[PDB]
Structure formats: structure tokens, C-alpha cells
Amino acid sequence: GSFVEMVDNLRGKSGQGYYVEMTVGSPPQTLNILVDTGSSNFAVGAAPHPFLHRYYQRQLSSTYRDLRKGVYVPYTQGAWAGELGTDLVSIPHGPNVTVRANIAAITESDKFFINGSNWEGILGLAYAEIARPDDSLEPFFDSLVKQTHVPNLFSLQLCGAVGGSMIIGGIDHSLYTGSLWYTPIRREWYYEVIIVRVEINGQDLKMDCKEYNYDKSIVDSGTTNLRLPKKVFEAAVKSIKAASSTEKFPDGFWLGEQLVCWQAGTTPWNIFPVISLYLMGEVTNQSFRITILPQQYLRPVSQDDCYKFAISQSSTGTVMGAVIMEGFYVVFDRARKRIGFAVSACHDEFRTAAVEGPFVTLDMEDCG
Template identity: 30%
Template sequence: MFKLVITILCLALIADAAFVRIPLNKPNKRRSVKNINALAAVLRHKYNPRKNVTSEELRNADNDAYYGAITIGTPPQHFQVLFDTGSSNLWIPGAPCAASDEACLTHNTYNASASSTYQLNNQSFAIQYGSGNLSGYLATDTVTISGLAVANQTFGVATAESNASFIAANFDGIFGMAFQQIAVDNVVPPFYNLYTQGLIDTPVFAFYLARNGTSSRGGELTLGGVDPKHYVGTLTYVDIFYESYWQIQVDSFSIDDTLVCLYCFAIVDTGTSLFGVPSDLYIGVQNAIGARSDTFGNYLVPCNYTSYLPVLYVNINGTSFNLTSDDYIVPVENDKGDIVCMSGFINSGGPVWVLGDVFIGKYYTVFDMEKDRIGFAPAAVNATVLN
């Protein structure tokens, strides 16, 4: 287990460690039908990868992605990264960009030659994902997050990216926060090093996503502990299934009084904006909320009918968490510029449920690597977040 591996390493350091708050940002624009469809395609590949291929997906720019600032190198080079509990690698674009690589050209890029703390790794790096791939090399340098300098962190430098959805993304790269077991090339994730180097108190982090926040006040990620101001009541904890993704067993999913799934597996993923439903249950869930498919396969409900829609109940370790239509119906803009009401349930592409930001936005979520568990509690409304 994670705590057994690192406790001895951290014993002498932990007394001076920090509890850290990371302000989160999110795009300040309305989602579009096109981008919701792109997200659905991404999710289907993420948890149903091709055999013998490591899968890590990019997020779509116009969805409610929550991202924040880090720096890499000496002197610091600045990046915005998506904090993703559904993957385990840190990667950012790297200079020089190829003339044809629009995604690289439109984002901040890492320049190894400009950093005095860069260490040559001599290993190539590649991630295969549903609609393309990225490739480059591994580098080792100092990675700083909220003033905490992680020494000798290895990360991916993408010099070629073929995923079109990354071109308009508001963030530069991905900061993976799942377990090392699913990291490409078995690279040690940066959160591990934050703890083993004594920079945080405990191997625990938590997300508060401000669903009605602004682009610059989108919520807060805490590293090294939990902030009680961000939730109400008590936390309900559930053990993770095994150390890879943040995967748990859910007692049941029900829509009003109708049982949808009993003792099912779910992955808790901050990198997924919506709510993933297993492929064999997907159509049934859409029918249960009265959503109907348009000619493009999008599931919509009349916007004047949303207040009559049923409640989804997610029972976790004996506690019921509910999502109303205010939570799972997403106003989006269609190709004509009209606002339509789309179901926030998307096909996960496999047998698992995916509790994405639709769920995490309503319920403060704690990821505890020390005790191999996840905690949930109702998120505080209008909680204070950092500027």
C-alpha cells in the first residue's frame, strides 16, 4: 500500500510540511453540443482502451474543466494544468513546436535549454488516446505548485500532439493524480513526490469545485489535508477497489424509486466533466429521465420540462447522494446558436460508472492515499476560494 511504502521516508520530514491551497480556474463560456460529443468520445476510449495501449485522454476546452497554475524549471516557466484524478502522468507541451502542431503553438511550452535544473532523461514518451496521440520525451526538472518545489520530478514533454480538441483548451497540459500503477513508463506522479519530499502533511488531497464560480474563482484543490469550510455535515468514506484509478464500489444507483444498478463499480474522475453511465445501462438511463435522441445522437429534454425530471440517487457506503435535474441537465449551444437542454449522462464506453464533475461539483471529494479511500460530503454553497 502507498502509505507503507512512503511512511519511513517521510517520518523525519513531516513535522515541517505544509497544508496547501490551489485556486482553480474554469472556462467562462457556455458549452456547445459539438464539444459535449467530443467529450463523450474521449470518455469511451479512456475507460475502454485498446489492448496493449496505454490510454490517457485530453479534455475538451469548452467543458467545465478545472485547472490551475504550476511552474517548471529554473527560472520558472509557467503553465496551466488540468488536475486529473483519472490519469497519473504530468505532461506539458514542449518547444520547439512543429509548424503543423497548432496545439503546441497556441499554448505555453517547456524549454529545457532555458532551465538550469533540467536533467536529460534520454527516454521517449508517448500516450495513445481515442482520437489521436501525443509523443515527445521524458524530462526531469523542478516542478513547483503553490510555492512547493518538487525536486527531480520526471514528466512528459509533448513535442507532437494530434488531438484537435486540445487546440482550444484553456490549459496547457495534464497533472495526473491517480496511482503510479497506471502511469505511462511507470513515472512517479508528482503528488507522490510532494509527500515523500516532506512538502505536505499527509498524502491526502481534496477538490471543491465552485459550480457557479467565475473563470478565476472556479474552486480549490487542497494538498495535504481537508478544508472543513468547503463542506457541510460529515464525510462519508468508502475504500477504493485497488490502487490504479480512484475506483470504488457503489451500493446502488436509482432513478426515483427504480433501481438501476446494485453493487456497481465507479471511477471518481475530476478530468471528466459529466457523468459516465455503463454502456449496457446508458439508453435506459436516458429513457428514465425522458431524454430523447436527436438526429445526431444527442439526448435532449425540453428546457421547460426540466423541473419535472426524476432524481438520481447514488448510495455510497450507506449514505444517499442525490442529483436533481439542476445537476445533471446541461444547457448547451447548438449549431444554430440556440440554447438546448442536454442530458449530462454520457456513455462511459465500458462497464463502469464515472463520477465526474457533475457529481464532484455538488459533493466535496477527498482522495486519501494514506488509507486508500475516498470521502464525500455536500459541498458548501458560496464557500470562500482563493483569488
């Protein structure tokens, strides 16, 4: 139980992201920061905004150093602009260290902050290759490992409906049951992995495995959904529809355009299939599988329980977002270039999320 003080250091509202407290500058300014394994910049709201309860005040921090360079980070859905600098940073419920880190002070944004989320910045935990303005801006975790003796590893327990744990520098055995199964990090930019097989209720989707990782597959704590490449999305929806045919749903439900609601406590979880993603293992021809329940891929949105189908389509590869992570204790073992999955200590009485192996899967190298 040595990592006990980091347990339950994450909070969130359902579907709006998990955040950790980080303390920046001198004297201390503590903010709520989105934990985001799908980006690589540490950035904080630094000016008033309708959706922010507070923001970073650089003028009040004696240890703040303006890098006198701007930074812009755009996505499909939203973007922010700000000014680069460095400052002292700690994580009060994380490792017992203080580092000098790059920090982007967000002065303007479009569709970035979420009304009511309670977070005021983002902690990009992915690698420098995808940092903005470029890969010379050292990400936070790189600084942490370079400046301290903290082991080059973190792990995430995301508990759905929110709370969870980010263990920095180690693995907490109370956060999981059974064994940890590891898949290689294919390339250090995003947390890129290789999906070798997909099943819906034990039935192989039977697509060429290249399609599952078409253009990449990433593990992303900052994305809510399981996102699938279009061809894979279509086949997966066809199969899920067929397996859940004891009730019919509007087409728009599968497209996230319509919600379905059930009276409190009556959601027929039993009618929906389990989904298995097989991941490349650490030994030649060996794989393992992670299995998710409808409780993960149907996300709650007061007499009625409304759900949105949280599998969606992508044109930029597969994104294993929070719907996948919530079933699991996930280990970002950067030191050994691998990601681990185990059943989370945070299902129903008939079925459980699972991590199972080993399986024999040949030509897995062909899937990338």
C-alpha cells in the same frame, strides 16, 4: 481557515476542464495544468501548437534533466507523444514546497489539447499502476509525498456554471457543509470505488449491482460526463425519460446527439429527476448516497440556454466525472485508501445536492 491560500486556485471554461497553475524549471515557467484524477502522468505542451497560448521550453531551464526516453499516452478520443525528463516543480497556489518530478514534454498530439481551454498540460493524480511507459515512472503526487512532509491527501471542490479549489495536504472546512462520507478505494490504480445501488427520483433501478461496476467504477476529474456501462445507461435513460415525461425530448437528446435550448432563465429543472448513487461505506453493511440534480447532468453548451445531456455510455466501466464531482467537496484520502464526499459550499429553491447516510446494504462485497 489555515488552507485559505489554496482556495479558488482552480479555473476553467465550462465542460473543458479544471486547471491549476504549476511552475516548472529554472528560471520559473508557469503553465496552466489540467487537474486529472483519471490518469497518472505529469505532461506539458513543449512545442508550438495552434491551441496552446504557451508551452514549456526545456532549453531555457537550467535544472531540466533529459531522461532520454520517449513516452506515448493513447486514449479512445486522443493521444500525445513526448520525451521524458525531470525538473523542479511547484504549485504557487498549492503547498509551500518545491519538488523534483518526472515531466513528459509533449512534442506531438492528436485531439488532445482543446481549442480555447487555456490549459497547456495535464496533472495525472491517479496511481503509478496506470502511469506510462510503465509503473516505474513515479507520478507527481507520489514524488510530492516522498520528498516533503505534505500529508498524502488532496481534496477537490469543482464549482460548475468556472472555478474551484484543490486543497493539497488537507481538508478545508469552509468548502463544504454537513458531514464527509467515505467510500473505500478498492484498488490503487484509478481512483476505483464500488457503487451498490442506483435510484432515479428515489426509485431503485433494480439492476444487479455487479453491472454498475462492470469492469470498474472510477472517480475522474478529467472526464466531463457521468459515464455508465451500456446496460446501465439504457436502464437509466428509460427511467429518466419516464420521470421527465411532462415534456418530451428527441431520442437523440438522451444520446447526446441533440441539444435542447430554453429562453434564458426558463429551464424547467423541476421536471427532471434527481439521481442517487449509493456507495460502499467504511463499516460492514453500511452505505451512503450522493444525490445529483439536473443542474449537474444537463450541461450548458445568448437569448437561449442550450443544454447537452451529460450522462453517456461507456464500454470501460462507470466514470464519475465532473457532473458528479461538481455537486460535492471530494476528498482523495490516499493515506487511508478512501474517498470522501460532502455537500459543496458551491441547486435551486426546491431541491439541493445531498450526501446522506447511513443506509443498510447487504452483500455489497458481491458488487465488485
